[PDB]
Design an enzyme around this catalytic site. Sequence first.
Site: not given
Length: 628
Positions: A292, A20, A295
């Site tokens: 978040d 990610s 990230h």
Amino acid sequence: HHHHLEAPSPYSTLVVFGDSLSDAGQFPDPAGPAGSTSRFTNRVGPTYQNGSGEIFGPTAPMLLGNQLGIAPGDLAASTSPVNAQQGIADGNNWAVGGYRTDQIYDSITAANGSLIERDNTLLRSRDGYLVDRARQGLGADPNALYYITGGGNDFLQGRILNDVQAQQAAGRLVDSVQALQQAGARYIVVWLLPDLGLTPATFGGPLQPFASQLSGTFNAELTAQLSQAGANVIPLNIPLLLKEGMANPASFGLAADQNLIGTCFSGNGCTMNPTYGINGSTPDPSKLLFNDSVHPTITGQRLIADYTYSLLSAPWELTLLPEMAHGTLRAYQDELRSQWQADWENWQNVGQWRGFVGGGGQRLDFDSQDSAASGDGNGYNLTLGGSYRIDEAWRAGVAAGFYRQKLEAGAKDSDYRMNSYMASAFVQYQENRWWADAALTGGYLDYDDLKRKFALGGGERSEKGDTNGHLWAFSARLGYDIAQQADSPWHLSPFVSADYARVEVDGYSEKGASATALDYDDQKRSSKRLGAGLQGKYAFGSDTQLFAEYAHEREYEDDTQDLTMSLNSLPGNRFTLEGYTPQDHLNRVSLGFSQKLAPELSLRGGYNWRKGEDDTQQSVSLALSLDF
């Protein structure tokens, strides 16, 4: 073949693997506009809300690829179902949100290894990068930049609970690096795992310390294994960069009054920042580090991109250093030739010294190449010398030159300054319309001020150093006068030249040990040139003369140079990047005059213009020539 308006661009494309941190949009964006794709960072704004119609912003590899001039289509995900439905071509970013080290490996090496699945349902699948490449009889792209993240999901999924498991996970990351290397990959950026105790996810909690220490273990195995893998890896020291950001947030464009590790922008799985969070008083994701729980926001993404770029862009400037010395060496040689042309068919008496002192200025002008920065700068010089007429047809002498040269190169006008001390011994022959020159030159180089600047945190950072070097050169040329007449007022002579020049600049280590600080190897660059030209001059009655020359040279040492280096913070991980490419053609014109100020005393001037495909050098000189 590089366009001079553009910054350098060494790489054919950017191929990305990982999780990610790097995903460019494999999964649909359920809460975004039609055709939207998911990236793990903040949305572009103005509301930043899910369902607002705003797409997710870019991730670091996308920003980096853009900086590096990569075709935009290459920066897209490799296996998005959205792209397929839309008829948008797959890109070279194989990173997938959620992937552990083992899945990252599979996406490179395995059949059906690129799986896009959400909630135990397969959205789309394709073969791992090397498998798809192999089905075209291809290994990796030897000209591509490769880029990898991974390890975090291994942690999230509880697969790393002790030192051994962390080391094993680091090994699985390295497996990926080795798969690409074995397949012919020549440039691989690899992240050290961030300090996982310094994420909103664990920070200030009871897991923080165990998180941090397992992160340490991972990276120690990573750097050690890579140290021995023999792959050409540029390691990102993310943990050290973050510490620096924490100590000085405003320098990274982050809010200096906020808790950047313990609060986030979105509030998903973490405490939303009250001021800059999505529903804070003044929402602004660029003011925060974390979107978040793990990230990075747009600001973090830019930092990562800029950090990688600063490392990548370093050789484009460092490789210009030998070219500064070739520049001053050639200007030095031009100033000597100017004296010879003023002396042409006009030597002092047998047994008598003719000496000169003079100086001048020079300008260096480099255009950008694929692996070389554009740059330009002024310099000045003092040159003196003397010849002794041994004979009717022979002459020998020596000369010395001091040259100060500065250069501003790169996006942020990195500042490089050099002192060159040269000397030479030369011999000359002219008899019966034949003439010939031969010169042995040596030089010492003091690079007294090396200030490398690059974009970072919306501002710029600089790293500083100084180094030494030396050079030696031989030059020769030969011609035949078209004037039959040794007392002709004009002389005109075609000639051939040969030149060898080896410039070597010692490696050095930039001061301190920041995350961006580099240590460079010794650098050397040789020039082998063969030339043809026409020189001539006209005397206007023993008091004044004008002379000129044109030459075309061919460089036979026209290989792209490269530089080996390592981060000061990671001494065991050395990598080699490409730099200056000498062009194979150069053209020069020289103009000069000599004016007698008295019997025995001449004032002399010269102007030189040298043009390669990617550069222009100029110099002017003034000198006094007296007879002993």
